[PDB]
Each structure stands twice: as C-alpha cells, then as structure tokens.
Design a protein around this ligand. Sequence first.
Ligand SMILES: NC(=O)c1ccc[n+]([C@@H]2O[C@H](COP(=O)([O-])OP(=O)(O)OC[C@H]3O[C@@H](n4cnc5c(N)ncnc54)[C@H](O)[C@@H]3O)[C@@H](O)[C@H]2O)c1
Ligand SMILES: NC(=O)c1ccc[n+]([C@@H]2O[C@H](COP(=O)([O-])OP(=O)(O)OC[C@H]3O[C@@H](n4cnc5c(N)ncnc54)[C@H](O)[C@@H]3O)[C@@H](O)[C@H]2O)c1
Ligand SMILES: NC(=O)c1ccc[n+]([C@@H]2O[C@H](COP(=O)([O-])OP(=O)(O)OC[C@H]3O[C@@H](n4cnc5c(N)ncnc54)[C@H](O)[C@@H]3O)[C@@H](O)[C@H]2O)c1
Ligand SMILES: NC(=O)c1ccc[n+]([C@@H]2O[C@H](COP(=O)([O-])OP(=O)(O)OC[C@H]3O[C@@H](n4cnc5c(N)ncnc54)[C@H](O)[C@@H]3O)[C@@H](O)[C@H]2O)c1
Lengths: 268, 268, 268, 268
Amino acid sequence: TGLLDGKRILVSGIITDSSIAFHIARVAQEQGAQLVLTGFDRLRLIQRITDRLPAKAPLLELDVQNEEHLASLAGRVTEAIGAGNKLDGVVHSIGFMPQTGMGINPFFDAPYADVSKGIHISAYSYASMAKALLPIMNPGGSIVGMDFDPSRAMPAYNWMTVAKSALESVNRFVAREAGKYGVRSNLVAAGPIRTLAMSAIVGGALGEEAGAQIQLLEEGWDQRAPIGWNMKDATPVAKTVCALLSDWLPATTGDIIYADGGAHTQLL
Amino acid sequence: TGLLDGKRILVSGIITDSSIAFHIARVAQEQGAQLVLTGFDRLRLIQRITDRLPAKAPLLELDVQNEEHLASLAGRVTEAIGAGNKLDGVVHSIGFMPQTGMGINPFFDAPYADVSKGIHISAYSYASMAKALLPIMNPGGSIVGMDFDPSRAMPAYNWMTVAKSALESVNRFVAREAGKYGVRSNLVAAGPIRTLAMSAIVGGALGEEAGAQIQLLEEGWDQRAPIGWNMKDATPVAKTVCALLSDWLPATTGDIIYADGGAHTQLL
Amino acid sequence: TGLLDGKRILVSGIITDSSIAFHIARVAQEQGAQLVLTGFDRLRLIQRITDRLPAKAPLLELDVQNEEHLASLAGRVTEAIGAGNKLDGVVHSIGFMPQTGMGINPFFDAPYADVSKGIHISAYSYASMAKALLPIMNPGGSIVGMDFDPSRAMPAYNWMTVAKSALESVNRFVAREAGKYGVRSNLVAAGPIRTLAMSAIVGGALGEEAGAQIQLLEEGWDQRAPIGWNMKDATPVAKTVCALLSDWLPATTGDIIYADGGAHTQLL
Amino acid sequence: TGLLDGKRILVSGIITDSSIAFHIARVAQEQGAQLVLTGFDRLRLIQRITDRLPAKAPLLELDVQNEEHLASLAGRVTEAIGAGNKLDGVVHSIGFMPQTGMGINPFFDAPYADVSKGIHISAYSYASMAKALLPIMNPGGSIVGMDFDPSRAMPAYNWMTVAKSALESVNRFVAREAGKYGVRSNLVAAGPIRTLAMSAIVGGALGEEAGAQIQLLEEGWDQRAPIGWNMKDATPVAKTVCALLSDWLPATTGDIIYADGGAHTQLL
Ligand SMILES: NC(=O)c1ccc[n+]([C@@H]2O[C@H](COP(=O)([O-])OP(=O)(O)OC[C@H]3O[C@@H](n4cnc5c(N)ncnc54)[C@H](O)[C@@H]3O)[C@@H](O)[C@H]2O)c1
Ligand SMILES: NC(=O)c1ccc[n+]([C@@H]2O[C@H](COP(=O)([O-])OP(=O)(O)OC[C@H]3O[C@@H](n4cnc5c(N)ncnc54)[C@H](O)[C@@H]3O)[C@@H](O)[C@H]2O)c1
Ligand SMILES: NC(=O)c1ccc[n+]([C@@H]2O[C@H](COP(=O)([O-])OP(=O)(O)OC[C@H]3O[C@@H](n4cnc5c(N)ncnc54)[C@H](O)[C@@H]3O)[C@@H](O)[C@H]2O)c1
Ligand SMILES: NC(=O)c1ccc[n+]([C@@H]2O[C@H](COP(=O)([O-])OP(=O)(O)OC[C@H]3O[C@@H](n4cnc5c(N)ncnc54)[C@H](O)[C@@H]3O)[C@@H](O)[C@H]2O)c1
C-alpha cells in the first residue's frame, strides 16, 4: 500500500526532468497518488517530459500571474478529475526572480518591477493557488510549497531570498484560511538542488563571483549536514513533500519542514 | 503495507495508557513495527498496561539515571531482538521535573539538585540513550525525542521549559554523532496532552494558580491552532513520531517537527 | 552630553505628532543630534507638525515610490547639511499597506497591485533609501528601520505582516552593503503604538472584527510583557532607535532589536 | 555626561585583564558608573587586576555554587554601597564547563556530574544571582548576562553550547521575575573573544582537532560579519553590555542582543 493511495494531488512546477516537481510527481505516483499537473508557457515541452512519469497525469496550463488561468483553474481541475471529486493535495513548486534581482548584479540595482515580478511568482502565487484550490479540496487535505531557508542573508540569492522570506510569511496566513477547510499548509525548505537553472548559475550564467559563491555555499552545506547533502539527488526532498501530503503529519500547519540534511541546525 | 513494516523500534516512556509513548507504540505496531519497550521503576504496572498493545513487545528496565542500566541496555535489546539484528528506531518519551521546579513554587526557589535531576532525566538522557543505542542501530535509522516548545517562557512550566531548551540543544549535537551511523535525530514538539500528570496539574496538584494558567494555556492553544488542538487526543502526535521513524523524512536531522495544530506559527 | 552629540541624522516618516518618527526626532534632538527630515505628499502639514520639535530641522520631499526623489535625495541632503558634511544616521519609519491588504477584507482578496504597492513602500524602500544615502554616510554610521514582529501570523495585519517579513529579509542584505561603508543596518521591532492610523483601526476603520482583534492583540501584549506595554507611549521605542543610532551597539548589524516590553519572549 | 552617570552596577566574572567583564567594568567606569565587583576563588589575583581599572571598586567573594555566598551577597553589596542605596545594574559574566564537556573529548563521554557543574555555573547561576540581587535593585534596573549563540550545534563547544541554550531559557524566566521589580533581564550574545581560556584552546589545550575547529569558527565569523569581527577586541561587547545597563533600551527584556559583528544574520 502506497503512502498516498487514493489521493488526488495537483503538482505545479515541472519544466524539465531535473525540476524538483518532476521528482515530487514521480514519488507521489510510486506511492499511489492520482495526479493532475500544471505547467507554465512551454506546454508541448512539459507534456513530453511528464510522459516519462510512471503513470498518466492530465496537464493544465497555469501562469500564476494570469488572473484568467487562476479564475478557471478549479473548473479545469474538477473537469480532469471528474465531477464530485475533490483534491487531497496541492504542490506549489514555482519560483522565479528576474536576473537583475540575483547574482553579481548589485542588490541595490534590482528595479522594483523586477523584484515585484519575482515576489508575485515566488510568494503571492502561493496565496493565489490556495484561493483557487481550497474550494475544491477535501478535509484532511494538504498544500505544500517549496522554500529555500531565507532566515539569514546569503551571497547571490539576493532578492530571491527576500521572496522566500515573504513566502514563509504568506504560508502562515494560508494556514489560517486552509484550516477552515480542514486543510494543512506547509513549506519544505530544501537544500540546494542541481536543477537546470542551478547548473547554469554554477556555470557562471549570473556572473563568475555569483557562480563561485553558490558553489561554495553548496560545499559548506554538505560539510555541515550531519547526514550529508547530495545536490544531484532531489529524491529526499520529493519524499519529504509526500510525507506532508500524507496523513502522517496531521497536526503540522503554517510550518516549515527542513529537507536539507540537517545543515541549518549546524554552524560549522 | 505498514509505514514501519519490518522496522525494529525501541519505545521508552510508557507509564500509563494515556502516556504519549503508549500511543506512539500502538500506531507503530498498527504500522508493522516490531517493538522493544523500556520502562522505569514500576515494571509490573508497565507490563499490564502494554499487554493492551495490539502485538507483544518485550519490556526492559531502564532508569536513565542508572549507569548500569545504560551500560547493559544494548546487550539486553539485542538479546530481545536476536543476535545479528539491529534497531531501526529509538523513541525517547521521558521527562520529569521535581515539583519544586514547576507550578506555583517560585522559579527562584527550585534548589539546584532538583533542577539538575530534571535536566538529567529530561535532557541529558537523550544523549545517554543515543550513546547506548547508536552501536546497535542500522543505517537509515531514526532517534526521536519528545519536546514542548520552550522558545518563549510560560507560566507554571518553569524549569521544565529550561530542561526542554537544553533538550533541543542536546538534539542538535546528537544529530552530529548519529550522522556517523547514517542515523537521524529529531524532536517532536507536541501541543499540550491530557496525560495523568497533566490532568493532575489542571486539578491543582501543583497549586491553584498553576492549574489556572495551564488550563488557560491549553485553551489559547486550540484557539490559535489553524486546524485546532485536541488535548485529549495523542494520536496526531503518535503519527508524527512515526513519520520521523519512517523513511519519509530522510533529509531531516538535528531538527524539531511541530505536532501542535500549527499553534506556534500564530500569534492570536 | 547628549547620546547623539554632533551626529547628523536623517529622519523619515513624520506625518502627525503621534507618528513614531516624531518621537524619534524629538528624543534625537534632546540628545544633541542635528536632523534633516523627509516627508511624503503633505509637506505644509509636515512642516507645521515639525515646527513643534525642540530644534529646527530642514524638511525635504521624499516619496519612496518616486525614482526622481530618490535620485536627487543625497544632493538635497548634502545641500541642507553643507558641502563636505555627511550623515551619521538614517531613520526609515515608513510603512503603508492598501486597505484591501488589511483588516476584515479576506487575505485571499488583496489584488497583487495593492500588495506590491505595500511591499514597495514598506520593504523595498528600506533598500531604496540605503542605496541613495550610503554614498553620503560616514563610517560608524547607522541605518534604522521600523518593524512589527512578523514571525507569526496574526489577525487583521495580514499583508502588512508579509511586508514586514520581507523588510526583515531586506535588512539583512542592506547590512551586507552598508558594511562596506562601515555602516550598520538594523530594525527596531516595536510593540503596538496608538498612532492616528492605529486609533482609526481600533475605531473600526478597517472593519469591526479587525478592530476587535487589534484591541485584543494590544491587551495580550501588555499582559505578556514582563515590564508591561503602554501603546500610548512611543518614547521607549524612540529611545531604542536612538540607542542603535549611537556608538553604543557598535557590533550589531543585519539585526532586530525588540522594543516591545519583552512580549515576544513570553507565551502567556 | 556618562551613559551610566550615577548608576550603581555589580560586575561579576573578572579573572584576568582579558576577561570580557574587565572591559565591561572599564567602559562602565569611563561612563560614570559606580561599581561593586564579585570574584571567584583567587581574590588576591582579582584585586591586583582590578587595581588597573580607572576608578576604585570594592571586591566581594562570590562562588555561585556556594549557598552561603549567595545568601549573604545582598548584605555584603549594600554594606559596600551604603545603607539606603540600591543597585541599578547587575552583570553576570560567569561561565564554566569541565574539560570532559568540551573539545576533542567525545560529546557522549561527558559524565552528568561534569555537565551538571557546567550548567550550575553557566545557566542556573543567572537565576541564583537575580534571586539574591533583585531585592536590592532599583526600578528601571537592568540585569545582563553573557551568551554565545547556541541556536545551532558547533564543533568543540559541545556541552557549553547546551549550557548557553539553558541560559537563554533561564533569562526569559528571570525577565518575568525581574519585571515585578521594574527591572530588565537580557543577554549579550558575543562573537568569539580571545580570552586567556580561548587562546589556550586555540593553542590545543582541549585537543588539536578542537583547536583547529575553534580557529576555523573564528575565521568564518569575521568573514560573515558585514562589519567584521575582531576577536582581540572586547570593547564593542563591553559597550553593548553598557547600552543594556543604560536607560536607552527601556522596552527590551527577556531578550538577546547580538554583539557579533552581525555574523549570525549571514549564512556565507
Ligand atoms: N533548486 C534549488 O536548489 C532549490 C532549493 C530550495 C527550494 N527551491 C524552490 O523549489 C521550487 C521549484 O524550483 P526548481 O528548483 O525545481 O526549478 P525549476 O526551474 O525546475 O522550477 C520552477 C518552476 O516555476 C515555474 N514558473 C515560473 N514562472 C511561473 C509562472 N508565472 N507561472 C507558473 N509557473 C511558473 C517554471 O515553469 C518552473 O516549472 C521553487 O520555488 C524554488 O525556489 C529550489
Ligand atoms: N503531556 C504533554 O502535554 C506534553 C507535551 C509535549 C511534550 N511532552 C513530553 O513527552 C514526553 C512523555 O511524557 P508524557 O506527557 O507522555 O507523560 P508520562 O508521565 O506519561 O511519561 C513520562 C515518562 O518518563 C518516565 N521517566 C521518568 N523518570 C525516568 C527515569 N529516571 N528513567 C526513565 N524513564 C523515566 C516515566 O516513567 C514516564 O513513563 C516527556 O518528554 C514530556 O515532557 C509532554
Ligand atoms: N503603529 C504601530 O503600532 C507600529 C508598530 C511597529 C512598527 N510600526 C512601523 O513604524 C513605521 C512608522 O509608522 P507609524 O506607526 O509611526 O505610522 P505613521 O502613519 O505615523 O507613519 C508612516 C509614515 O509613512 C509615510 N509614507 C507612506 N507612504 C510613503 C511613501 N510613498 N513615501 C514616503 N513615505 C511614505 C507616511 O507619510 C507616514 O509619515 C512603519 O514602518 C510602521 O509599520 C508601527
Ligand atoms: N570568550 C568568548 O569567546 C565568549 C563569547 C561569548 C560569550 N562568552 C561568555 O562570557 C562570559 C565571561 O567569560 P570570558 O570569556 O570573559 O572568560 P573568563 O574566564 O575571563 O571569565 C569567566 C569567569 O567565570 C568565573 N567563574 C567560574 N566559575 C565560577 C563560580 N563557581 N562562581 C563564580 N564565578 C565563576 C571565573 O572566575 C571567571 O572570572 C561567560 O559566560 C562566557 O561563556 C565568552
């Protein structure tokens, strides 16, 4: 018997086969979950990547900055899962910050429009998704978002760290609203993961100094983590998201679970 | 298939049928775990209470303040589980603070010997148990302890809160040592639970003012918790301990999971 | 000898005589600081209110959302303090969240444009001010911003709490940039203060339920605070801002000082 | 006019001229405070070191583990400051952990008696001192203790970190009791300081690996700190203690002020 046997779960954020959400979707399906997927802009690309998941899952277009996509979301989901069926889980694995807000570009040089775009996609959208999906969620349901520990400032991450701080605050309020539906809302704070974007940054896409800093940050992470950290393996992160989607953390809400090898609990 | 299918788990802290550890033991057995239990002082009492668990589990005497009990523990466990078998899980559900360190008795009036006894049992023993059990634990293993959020001072709990602050610090160091064995170490910070001791305190066993404060603390907790809090139900806490004992939080260590209805994430 | 004797300090955020920044400006002048003030929109109003300060201070127009005001700020300040003189201190006491983002209006109903306006003014502007003022700041300088503890979600404050979480994150990055100039950056997290806006909210300006919640929040605050909390007295907050502007906290940066009567350190 | 003009302050913890408390005492006297000093065991040594302070200060014997010294403390202080005079400030700058609880000696190998001694001196004594001194403290008074950020586990510091976690918890309760006298209670969390004991540890007194780890910890600290960290300079720490002893942080209690160059607010 699967951990998510009989659960209907919406998974957003797949772009490539290295996306954290691809691994969340794989593990959830291995655990008996019936999935509905949401994708942004490049849907032909997303459909081909998701064809490799162990089971079939309908794909729906969702640009979190689009008011029409959000207003029609619940109707499109229920149409994909069948009338009279509701979701048991929602996975928010969406994040973006324009290049001006990250890397070698000075912190003070990011124009507000770019910061605002990044916060809209990375933080506000967590509330936006919950607003659209809570009316079609079952009691005992679970909303999970992806976080990167922003409690301390760090090189290169810059305004994305600010967006994550706002996300953690948004999550605590989403928990208040979700509670009225008998639904939990939590974040998984993951360690660094070698996604296509991350590999590009290490490769110097956002500047040499930013690349050097991010590579050093990842090395320090594995060193600190009492059980180590493998940036090339998103499976421990995917399993943690599934733990929160399950009935096994029923008294946890407005909270953050750290899937970071325990690195944030250690100084050196 | 059970969440803890094939896992060998040691569970300490059963005294009565309302002990949090009784519920941890029940849920773990419902989930396919094979248990070994440890009990303090009143073993005839503990054996009769544990007879009501869905499956048989050997009972071993363990006074955490006794150096001989700790030195012979691993040998006694392996004798109960069979030579060549190791533990996959350890549950520390032990806590005690002499009456002088709690309730209406003034904070400044607790003599050091009493505070020291309370910290020995409630905090140091987490390290003591890990030292005794880590040599007989399998990689991928998990040690879980019971916590009561001590980040803020609260009426009546007094020196027990101080002992919990020390426990959280001990846990982060146990995580460093346990990591070398491929073992995780975490705490479950539970909301208030109506154990025999708790009911006695509400009943005024530690003074009227302390009883009034603890009853008010519990009411505020349910009010704050976005999903509510049922002090009479230890099952959500027991399930959370099992989530940490499972393979579903594999990247979490030196950490604290809050099974408190989300009360600590809300101000009012 | 005054605490801020010989210091040139910029103070933003005065709108009325009950503004926290009015009290910051008064105490700073009582302590020998030479001030330059910034005001938003209603400058005739601000000039008349600031006429009541114990000493004269030049007033400069500053709309933090205006790119031209920010680009000319340093030039206007240096013109007011004299060529060859730099600032020793900067006070950010600016906050705003459109009504849709606060009170009885549901959390999910705040449109992004309103949230974005609120975050621009309340969080991004802390970075904006530092970018404009750091080139005209002396080593040993200090930037202070006003915070309202957003670590936990609370009724009514809603998106303003989210903006404060973003502000705390912005502050840690401003500290990195300010450090290069030998300048500190910190926040003062104040308890609730009966400003004109706060009195209006208690009076039901943002809805009855929000008014009731905010009044209850303030009462709980004084109760929890080991030294109490007087919402009608901004002087303890003003003194704390001056402590950070002084040479008496020289090793504190990227940090938060709580001037809340110790309420955040107590559960009940 | 001095920051502590007319204040009567008790300063414990002087052992050598590099003790943090020596610098606290110097800065306080430079700021007009009238001091009373307490010393442990080697009083002839302490008297000769304190002779170098800018002004005379009476020295009283105080072993925090001695019940008689604590019971007679208030009487001895009032005798030194004159009948009808009370203290305005108390500085707790006392810390000790037996060698078994620190360095290369394994975390699990520290016997409870040694851990208990270390917690008695380093944490319980903060409550012990407050109990003895609060009856002879004026309203508006301030108690300050010395902390080393224990929120994360770190190599070598081991059980001393556990003692600091307990100290932070003790401080929040001392704040509750001190509030009844109109007195504040706070901790100063300092960065690493090259005291005689610290230099000895870097020199390998607690083992080579511990020495290497502590030297690395200090280097990382200066690197992270946006304003840097000078382990050879206790003056910024001494000034911060004086800020808390002054009337300039009147709304801060049960709290922790970080005098660490802002290192704890930065990840890398
Ligand atoms: N990679 C890491 O090291 C790391 C660590 C911790 C947390 N996270 C977080 O995990 C989440 C997933 O990112 P990832 O690392 O797997 O990278 P990714 O690039 O694989 O996924 C990000 C996703 O966001 C989507 N997205 C962007 N703008 C959108 C919009 N307007 N509407 C809808 N979707 C939009 C993209 O299509 C993409 O699928 C993000 O929240 C990220 O911040 C990443
Ligand atoms: N009850 C609550 O509200 C609450 C909330 C959060 C956390 N906790 C924690 O949960 C844990 C379990 O306590 P509980 O609430 O179930 O109460 P309990 O009284 O049922 O269990 C405490 C156990 O500690 C054992 N113990 C005491 N001294 C011992 C010693 N010297 N050696 C070995 N065992 C010893 C007792 O025998 C008992 O089985 C404790 O750590 C407690 O602090 C309790
Ligand atoms: N009142 C409280 O209970 C409380 C508690 C903690 C923190 N704070 C914070 O203290 C700060 C000062 O607010 P206050 O409570 O004294 O109220 P206030 O209304 O007196 O001051 C807020 C100021 O922000 C200014 N402002 C708004 N939009 C601006 C813009 N576009 N450009 C420039 N300035 C702009 C206003 O002109 C006003 O002077 C804010 O950051 C607030 O969030 C308030
Ligand atoms: N040195 C650092 O890097 C550092 C950093 C942060 C915090 N701290 C803390 O600062 C405080 C002062 O220590 P320090 O670093 O200046 O070292 P220190 O050795 O100079 O001072 C410690 C003092 O504690 C006293 N003490 C020990 N046992 C005692 C007892 N039984 N009764 C009374 N006094 C007793 C000693 O006599 C000594 O004066 C301690 O709490 C320490 O943990 C030190």
